[PDB]
């Protein structure tokens, strides 16, 4: 039923294995029992496999597993028992394991880990995914005892009803802690015991409306948390402030993230309470992706947050219906260096107001990829107020053309005009450019004087002729693949004296002898430089290897 | 025997000479001509239409056309005419003297003999009611009157009263606050159009303009009203709307609007209207601090059948507060998202809805918006960024939908798992469809299917056999794999059902029409 590879890596092909084969070949190191009709697992069906370390039992329907069956594997590492029906675990299986690294028991009917200190002799694991979004409702100290160090710890406690104190204060260090929890009842008490032990905390599926913060007696012990992520969380204007008070308990916090959350409010937040006012702390990066706001069209100007804007250096607010970043707010974000407003509702008139005089004074990178911009000239003129702007990504915006001349920030170095629907390129493109991307357009030719351009991406266009190399002396990278290029001037690549990479594949290279002698010969010694492999229009035979009489 | 000579945009400084005597239409528009001599055109005995607009003629002797007895259309608009010498002319049907430099109305007593005059274009910086008397007996179809930039001093309110037209278009001065008292309510006008209107002073906001609009209530003949190039405050804009609402107009059009200020006037009275259709195009607004809902509420509760709003930055639209009479809505080219009209049960009479060129993304949500639109028959969500997540399950489309346009989006073949039952017209061109699943056969009513410009390489054998209602299909601009043991069915079907195929599906690489491939 298997199709093992030449290294002992057996694949569970025909998914219908009623159980584990009779005494498998011991020279096996890996297996594949993903999605197979299984229900029983004993020691007399995988006995002669002490050299097996890769066990994957993903979704089989395993009801019962006879004990003493993991000793027959001895040194097992990647141990997977994902989405099965093992509703009653036992420290017996976590006894034979000597060299374990990945233990996943997510998706099983069990609702507890037993009051018999589970996970013990497997004192070598770094990743442990325990829990199920169905019935797991208890976590006692009698869990996570035989492990003090691990990289990633994921606990699917969706319906967590009770958390025994200090059931997590045991583990000393956890680089990434992922927690699934619908209600916020036991959130503060799970926090107090992990705050000094975790580096990157992640909360999922929690309804934080009505979440209230109360000064927890966790002590003046500094938090180890530097990154706090909230995923698919529900928050209101008031609770968001409460969350802020909690974040101020992590003075070392540097990065805040919100993925696919819902804000049931209009942004009428309070920046202070009656006791402690929210402190910006050391948070330097804020990442918000797909934030659902029912009344987005009614959102406030955020002036209630001006006191938390002076220090942040990187901001991402993606696909969240942003139609305006108020001028006053943009003027307060005095340290902002990187701003990504991709997939929003930005148009020229409002980008002008967002980027008013003195707005985002330190900004060097602005990303407006999938918005609603239509005029290159006006988009460029609008950014002139950002004196230190050097990187602009306005790809996936429907500019259809560009005038002969345009105004752009003085120090423009990177301009992304990919999937922009342009038919030609003109002097509008700034001369100071170092990296230009005009891929995925309708370009027929390219003849721009860009003296210091190091990278040109112009793939997926309709270029008959190669881009003028005599105007791109410093050209290091050149992606010209997928372009309808048939011939090419002789000695043209002698111009690019520093060329390092080049894409030429997917072009109708006419390999007739009285023409390709140069190109077909250039691709020889210049092998490391070529990316992929150009072919002949009349034969799949590569052009790099064909010389003429 | 229509002979045409077009020498427009040729940079001509003189009327081109030596032209065919067959010439019936001469177009020398957009040049640098400054004079028109009898000798320039006396040989063109068959000249019926002469276009010399956008030139620099300062004086024109009308006797210069005495040898062009066939002339019926003369366009001298956009020149520098300050004087016209009157002499009996031909019986023109169209005379355009608009956009010139005349001080007084250029009406010759001779024009009174132009019994077939349908269109009359004029210009003035000064207008006297009497100067129109010469053409008062003429039943003119349309009159266009451009008021010079210095129009205003010593103004006569009754200036327009003697005009006898069905349609009238007044072009007021540009770059000047509206302080005119000229009464635009003319006895015979059914279709009125007014252009350049500016009143950006909140204090005494458009009192002058609103006053002339008020006088339109007394004109029962007024059926259509068009306003162009408006620059005003949000309050005044809403007042203009309110005032027109109580007139006898059936068709109201507004285009090119610049708005500023804060909207305070929210109390709109929709009673006593005769409006059948309202369209608003190209609106730009300054940033503001009042809730956007103030704007949306006003428009969402309008008691009219036809409503169009295009070329604005509107990011949302609310559901009407009560069962709405909206029948056809065109909201193309704005910034609307998936939640437009969400949680609605009041668009039960809506038959047509256009949402082309907005910011739509999730098809499931769009289908739900549709659930309570029990009368919806046509829906256009083309030119957006719509994709469908099959993990969302079955869509909730109303069963009344008959025509669905989803072209120019990013849909895949999963789209066939989310389609209205009785669908007749389905346009899916320019998407990311890589195959046509078996689910398509369930579309028993499908008459027109357009899957051009996608990524189809082949279709399952017999795929179209159960589409008995099919009459038109687009399959072109797809990378069809014409290797024989695979393209057999399609090539045969495309050959026998030749009348149904729109355009011509062709083979990838080969370039030959699929219809012409023969397999063994």
């Amino acid at each position: 039923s298997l199709s093992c590879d030449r290294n002992g890596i057996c694949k569970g092909s025909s998914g219908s294995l009623n159980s584990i084969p009779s005494g498998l070949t011991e020279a096996v190191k890996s297996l594949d029992l993903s999605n197979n009709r299984i229900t029983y697992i004993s020691n007399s069906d995988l006995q002669r496999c002490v050299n097996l370390q890769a066990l994957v039992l993903t979704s089989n329907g395993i009801n019962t597993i006879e004990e003493d069956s993991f000793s027959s594997l001895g040194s097992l590492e990647h141990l997977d028992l994902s989405y099965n029906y093992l509703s009653n675990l036992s420290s017996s299986w976590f006894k034979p394991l000597s060299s374990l690294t990945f233990l996943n028991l997510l998706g099983n009917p069990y609702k507890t880990l037993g009051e018999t200190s589970l996970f013990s002799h497997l004192t070598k694991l770094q990743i442990l995914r325990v829990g199920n979004m169905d019935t797991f409702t208890k976590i006692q100290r009698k869990d996570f005892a035989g492990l003090t160090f691990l990289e990633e710890l994921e606990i699917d406690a969706s319906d967590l009803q009770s958390y025994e104190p200090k059931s997590l204060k045991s583990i000393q260090n956890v680089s990434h802690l992922i927690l699934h929890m619908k209600q916020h009842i036991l959130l503060l008490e799970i926090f107090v015991d992990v705050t000094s032990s975790v580096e990157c905390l992640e909360l999922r599926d929690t309804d934080l409306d009505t979440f209230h913060f109360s000064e927890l007696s966790t002590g003046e012990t500094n938090s180890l948390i530097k990154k706090f992520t909230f995923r698919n969380v529900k928050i209101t204007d008031e609770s968001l402030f409460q969350v802020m008070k909690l974040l101020n308990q992590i003075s070392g916090l540097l990065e805040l993230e919100f993925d696919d959350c819902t804000l049931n409010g209009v942004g009428n937040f309070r920046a202070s309470d009656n006791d402690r006012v929210i402190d910006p702390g050391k948070v330097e990066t804020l990442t918000i992706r797909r934030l659902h706001i029912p009344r987005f069209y009614l959102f406030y100007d955020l002036s209630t947050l001006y006191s938390l804007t002076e220090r942040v250096k990187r901001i991402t607010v993606e696909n969240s219906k942003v139609f305006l970043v108020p001028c006053l707010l943009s003027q307060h974000l005095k340290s902002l260096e990187y701003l990504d407003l991709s997939e929003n509702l930005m148009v020229e008139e409002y980008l002008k107001n967002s980027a008013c005089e003195d707005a985002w004074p330190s900004l060097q990178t602005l990303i407006l990829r999938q918005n609603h911009l239509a005029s290159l000239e006006k988009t460029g003129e609008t950014l002139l107020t950002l004196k230190n702007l050097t990187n602009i990504d306005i790809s996936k915006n429907s500019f259809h053309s560009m005038p002969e001349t345009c105004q752009w920030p003085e120090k423009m170095k990177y301009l992304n005009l990919s999937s922009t629907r342009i038919h030609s390129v003109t002097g509008c493109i700034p001369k100071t450019l170092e990296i230009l991307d005009v891929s995925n357009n309708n370009l027929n030719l390219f003849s721009l004087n860009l003296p210091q351009l190091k990278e040109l991406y112009i793939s997926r266009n309709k270029l008959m002729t190669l881009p003028d190399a005599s105007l791109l002396p410093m050209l290091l990278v050149l992606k010209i693949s997928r372009n309808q290029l048939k011939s090419v001037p002789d000695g043209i690549f002698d111009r690019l004296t520093s060329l390092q990479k080049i894409w030429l594949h997917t072009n109708p290279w006419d390999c007739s002898c009285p023409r390709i002698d140069y190109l077909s010969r250039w691709l020889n010694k210049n092998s490391q430089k070529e990316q992929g492999s150009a072919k002949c229009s009349g034969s799949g035979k590569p052009v790099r290897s064909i010389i003429c009489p | 025997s229509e002979f045409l000579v077009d020498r427009s945009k040729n940079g001509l400084i003189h009327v081109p000479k030596d032209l065919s005597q067959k010439t019936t239409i001469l177009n020398i528009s957009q040049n640098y001509i400054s004079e028109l001599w009898t000798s320039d055109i006396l040989s063109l005995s068959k000249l019926r239409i002469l276009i010399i607009s956008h030139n620099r003629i300062q004086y024109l002797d009308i006797s210069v056309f005495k040898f062009n007895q066939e002339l019926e259309y003369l366009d001298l608009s956009h020149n520098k005419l300050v004087k016209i010498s009157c002499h009996p002319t031909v019986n023109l049907k169209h005379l355009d003297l608009s956009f010139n430099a005349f001080d007084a109305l250029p009406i010759c007593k001779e024009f009174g003999n132009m019994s077939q005059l349908k269109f009359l274009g004029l210009s003035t910086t000064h207008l006297e009611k009497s100067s129109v008397l010469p053409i008062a007996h003429l039943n003119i179809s349309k009159v266009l009157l451009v008021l010079g930039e210095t129009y205003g001093e010593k103004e006569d309110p009754e200036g327009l009263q003697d005009f006898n037209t069905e349609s009238l278009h007044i072009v007021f001065p540009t770059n000047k606050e509206f302080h005119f008292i000229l009464d635009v309510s003319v006895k015979t006008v059914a279709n009125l159009e007014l252009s350049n209107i500016k009143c950006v002073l909140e204090d005494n906001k458009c009192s002058y303009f609103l006053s002339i609009l008020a006088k339109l209530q007394t004109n029962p003949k007024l059926s259509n009203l068009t306003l162009n190039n408006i620059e005003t405050t949000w309050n005044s804009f809403i007042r203009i709307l309110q005032l027109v609402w109580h007139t006898t107009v059936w068709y109201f059009s507004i285009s090119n609007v610049k708005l500023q200020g804060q909207l305070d006037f929210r109390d709109f009275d929709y009673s006593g209207t005769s409006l059948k259709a309202l369209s608003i195009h190209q609106v730009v607004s300054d940033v503001f601090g009042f809730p956007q809902s103030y704007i949306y509420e006003i428009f969402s509760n309008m008691n009219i059948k036809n409503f169009t709003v295009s070329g604005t930055r509107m990011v949302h639209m609310l559901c009407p507060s009560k069962i709405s009479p909206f029948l056809h809505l065109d909201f193309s080219n704005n910034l609307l998202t998936d939640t437009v009209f969400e949680n609605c049960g009041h668009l039960t009479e809506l038959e047509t809805l256009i949402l082309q060129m907005n910011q739509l993304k999730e098809l499931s949500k769009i289908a739900e918006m549709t659930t309570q639109m029990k009368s919806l028959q046509q829906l256009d969500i083309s030119q957006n960024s719509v994709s469908y997540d099959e993990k969302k399950g079955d869509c909730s489309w109303t069963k009344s939908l008959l025509s669905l346009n989803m072209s120019s989006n990013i849909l895949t073949d999963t789209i066939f798992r989310c389609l209205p039952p009785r669908i007749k017209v389905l346009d899916l061109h320019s998407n990311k469809i890589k195959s046509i699943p078996k689910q398509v056969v369930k579309l028993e009513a499908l008459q027109e299917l357009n899957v051009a410009s996608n990524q189809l390489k082949s279709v399952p054998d017999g795929i179209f056999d159960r589409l008995t209602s099919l009459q038109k299909i687009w399959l072109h601009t797809n990378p069809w794999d014409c290797s024989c043991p695979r393209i057999d069915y399609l090539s045969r079907w495309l050959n026998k059902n030749s009348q149904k195929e729109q355009g011509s599906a062709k083979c990838s690489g080969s370039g030959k029409p699929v219809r012409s491939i023969i397999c063994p």
């Binding site: 009428n268 009614l298 406030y300 | 601090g289 809730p291």
Partner: peptide
């Protein structure tokens, strides 16, 4: 861009 009313 609603302005806080107070």
């Amino acid at each position: 861009x609603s302005k806080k009313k107070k």
